[PDB]
Ligand binder design. Structure first.
Ligand SMILES: O=C(O)Cn1ccc2c(OCCCN(Cc3cccc(C(F)(F)F)c3Cl)CC(c3ccccc3)c3ccccc3)cccc21
Ligand SMILES: O=C(O)Cn1ccc2c(OCCCN(Cc3cccc(C(F)(F)F)c3Cl)CC(c3ccccc3)c3ccccc3)cccc21
Ligand SMILES: CC1=C(/C=C/C(C)=C\C=C\C(C)=C\C(=O)O)C(C)(C)CCC1
Ligand SMILES: CC1=C(/C=C/C(C)=C\C=C\C(C)=C\C(=O)O)C(C)(C)CCC1
Lengths: 207, 241, 241, 202
């Protein structure tokens, strides 16, 4: 009934339906088109007011794409596999000035996804969680978006209990990737100037 | 279920918060008083409200440090890791403690019992609306959750033990420590909110919101530089740098 | 008074606009019609409104290129410079021409005499409020300036001949060309607004507002990608890449 | 009276009161100069009479253009580069290597070079910055009309100043103003084919 309200089968179908820095930007450019294709296949998304649909996509696009290419790169050694088949390696990243954030995607997203063997269904659900964010400004009815998000929580937990019955904390483990994804998304959005811009704490700890 | 071990741990956490906070309360006179000055264009009055607010914040950070020191496993981390954890989680814990003190009736926030402030009070100190509003919205939202002392304490512990903070060396160990509180909170909410299993996910998602709020805060920090409104040494160290 | 050459050059700019515009008008019947459908949630109706608007923009762009070719010295620039100036000034001239078609009374904008729209109509096409609102505000402010045909035509030429557009090669020549129009404009204000000199700087500062509006547009262009609302080939050429 | 309403003597004094990898250093220099903004603004005639909240709004909206304008003018002597408030020089070669050559060159040609070539004086620089400061279009002003009024007073004071100090350059006022669109586009930047050819051939 939790799955019936938000079928993880549809969410899966949605996922299956869709300078090194220059490479990356061209890759994002490519996938931008997929976003509405994917979203329309997420149960009940198409039932939200058209204005609300635009708002959710506008708010979640970067975290949505980042999550996608991270899970895609689980097979890569020290880099990522773009939607254009190209590879970006750690080295190339550091030499272009974006080493820190690149490294963060690798450790917090890619490797964690590899290590826990996050499945495409799990990825899909996390993306639906990112998508259904009620806090974005201008939403016609936030309660409705919040309601759908919670249907994903219910549906995902159910999915994890049944598919991974002897991992009782896997659900929590999936959600706990989201804080990191949010921080990374914000970093990737912050503009040039801000992007490129000790004693008293030690004192207090030692007292 | 919750083991006696886990119930004990939770009690320890909550007692630590009470202890830390009673130390804050008796430090309360160290804070520059709130001006009674009648003139909204007084720049001296503005500065003094800012002095008052930043000094309250310092008390908060002090309480947060005192609390972390009592978390099992924290002092066993390298000092570098203790500092990497506290530097970035301070604003998040301060936000959680703040939401805890939001009054929906008057739409105000009360610190140390005697200092109550509404949105306009915070603006009279020179804080920008895009800092003020999201924090009031976060507070209301948290207030809606109706969390108790146990649930705040665990969520605060989970926030502190976030391995993805910049500069954390021993991420494995920080996650292992966080996982204890996560598991405990989960058992706690399934036991105490048996008809609302969604309470657990609702809470963990607050950690996501705190990330956005941390970025909002950093934008307010910068905005302050533009007014040349300087942060106290402690706050400058943890946030300006 | 204005020199014979400034008078001739102004007559030419005004004639060129009237002639280019009469041709646009002859195409009004060709434009996809505004939708009749009653359903705010109809994606099909939204797309049709978007199509109508993009088709209008093409008409506008056609007029701008047609007018530019009449600008003395324009065709003597290389093809590359001609293109560099047009690709980036197009949105600015479109905004100036839109501001002449603003109706303060109904807070509406009218294209080709028959197609009048208010803020809500533009939102109904899926355009964002961040885009719509600054354009209405600009339109209202321009309207208040109450410029005449010569004054708009001069400002359009001045905008077109901006040496600082990306990819401009013969910047010195572009600047020399712009200088001719700026001087003419200053003479025109001195003669025709002898008791209101502030009209000159007021007009020139609108060139600044147009830089911001151009950024606002660029942001709306990205948002269209997010909705996969495809621009027609011409518009895509000048704005996508 | 135009000058009495907005004295250029005061604007000059405001400017004088606030004298003293590449991208990181450029950012650190900007950070150093942030504190100068209220110090400079308080000496611009009438700025201090605005609501405290409006004052904050004007400085928040204008900060980057205000700083860019100042270092640009400071860089008038430097060849192919800029002089940072920290004393560092950044040469255009080093800027291209660091991957911001396009915006850097734009600064050199539209701002530094034009300032050098016309010998933009400090009073004129101050007035242009005042024009940037008194921007009535930023969201949240308690009274845009008052800010707009002040801006027009700079227009009149600045023009009066150009006619008196450079009577043999009737284009000078306009010339100064024409630097502002380039400054705005640069300031915005620092914060972030076939069919045409066929139309041109018809
Ligand atoms: O009250 C107790 O029992 C313990 N205690 C004492 C002080 C205390 C406390 O200090 C509050 C100081 C007020 N705050 C000061 C402050 C905090 C953090 C950063 C800054 C800034 F960077 F300088 F802007 C400031 Cl001025 C503002 C407060 C807030 C609330 C609502 C709208 C706007 C601002 C706030 C709270 C949390 C995070 C960010 C902003 C926060 C929480 C518990 C506390
Ligand atoms: O009317 C005449 O006689 C000549 N004429 C015919 C069409 C015509 C004209 O076309 C306007 C088409 C409507 N516009 C279409 C459009 C224009 C530019 C970019 C886009 C975008 F990129 F697709 F978003 C669009 Cl859809 C929108 C219009 C506007 C007005 C008010 C609020 C929001 C949007 C606009 C106008 C100018 C710049 C940006 C946006 C603009 C000016 C004169 C014109
Ligand atoms: C991550 C990252 C960046 C951009 C991320 C964005 C905005 C999404 C990319 C989409 C892709 C790459 C999709 C795909 O290939 O499927 C920037 C530019 C800061 C530099 C390197 C770190
Ligand atoms: C122009 C420029 C940039 C930003 C400049 C800004 C916004 C601040 C300058 C202040 C200084 C440099 C003050 C001084 O030294 O007086 C960025 C970061 C995009 C890098 C490319 C060159």
């Amino acid at each position: 009934s939790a799955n019936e309200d938000m079928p993880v089968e549809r969410i899966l179908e949605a996922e299956l339906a869709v300078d090194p820095v220059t490479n990356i930007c061209q890759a994002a450019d490519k996938q931008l088109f997929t976003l509405v294709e994917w979203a329309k296949r997420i149960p009940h998304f198409s039932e939200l007011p058209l204005d609300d649909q635009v708002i959710l996509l506008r708010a979640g696009w970067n975290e949505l794409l980042i999550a996608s290419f991270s899970h895609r790169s689980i097979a890569v050694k020290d880099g990522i596999l773009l939607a254009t088949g190209l590879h970006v390696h750690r080295n190339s990243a550091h030499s272009a000035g974006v080493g820190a954030i690149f490294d963060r995607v690798l450790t917090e997203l890619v490797s964690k996804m590899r290590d826990m063997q996050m499945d495409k269904t799990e990825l899909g659900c996390l993306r639906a969680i990112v998508l259904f964010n009620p806090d974005s400004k201008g939403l016609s009815n936030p309660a409705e978006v919040e309601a759908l998000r919670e249907k994903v929580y219910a549906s995902l937990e159910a999915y994890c209990k049944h598919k991974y019955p002897e991992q009782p904390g896997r659900f929590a483990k999936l959600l706990l990737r989201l804080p990191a994804l949010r921080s990374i998304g914000l970093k990737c959005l912050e503009h040039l100037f801000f992007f490129k811009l000790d004693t008293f704490l030690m004192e207090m700890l030692e007292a | 279920q919750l083991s006696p071990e886990q119930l004990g741990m939770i009690e320890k956490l909550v007692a630590a918060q009470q202890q830390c906070n009673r130390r804050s309360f008796s430090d309360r006179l160290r804070v520059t008083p709130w001006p009674i000055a009648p003139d909204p264009q007084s720049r001296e009055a503005r500065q003094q409200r800012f002095a008052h607010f930043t000094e309250l914040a310092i008390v908060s950070v002090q309480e947060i440090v005192d609390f972390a020191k009592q978390l099992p496993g924290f002092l066993q981390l390298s000092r570098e890791d203790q500092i990497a954890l506290l530097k970035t989680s301070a604003i998040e814990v301060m936000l959680l403690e703040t939401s805890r003190r939001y009054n929906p009736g008057s739409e105000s926030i009360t610190f140390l019992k005697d200092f109550s402030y509404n949105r306009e009070d915070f603006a009279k100190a020179g804080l920008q609306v895009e800092f003020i509003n999201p924090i009031f919205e976060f507070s209301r939202a948290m207030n809606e959750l109706q969390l108790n002392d146990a649930e705040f304490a665990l969520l605060i512990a989970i926030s502190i033990f976030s391995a993805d903070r910049p500069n954390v060396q021993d991420q494995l160990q920080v996650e292992r420590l966080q996982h204890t509180y996560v598991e405990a909170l989960h058992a706690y909410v399934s036991i105490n909110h048996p008809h609302d299993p969604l309470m657990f996910p609702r809470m963990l998602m607050k950690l996501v919101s705190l990330r956005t709020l941390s970025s909002v805060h950093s934008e307010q920090v910068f905005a302050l530089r533009l007014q040349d409104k300087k942060l106290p040494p402690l706050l400058s160290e943890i946030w300006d740098v």
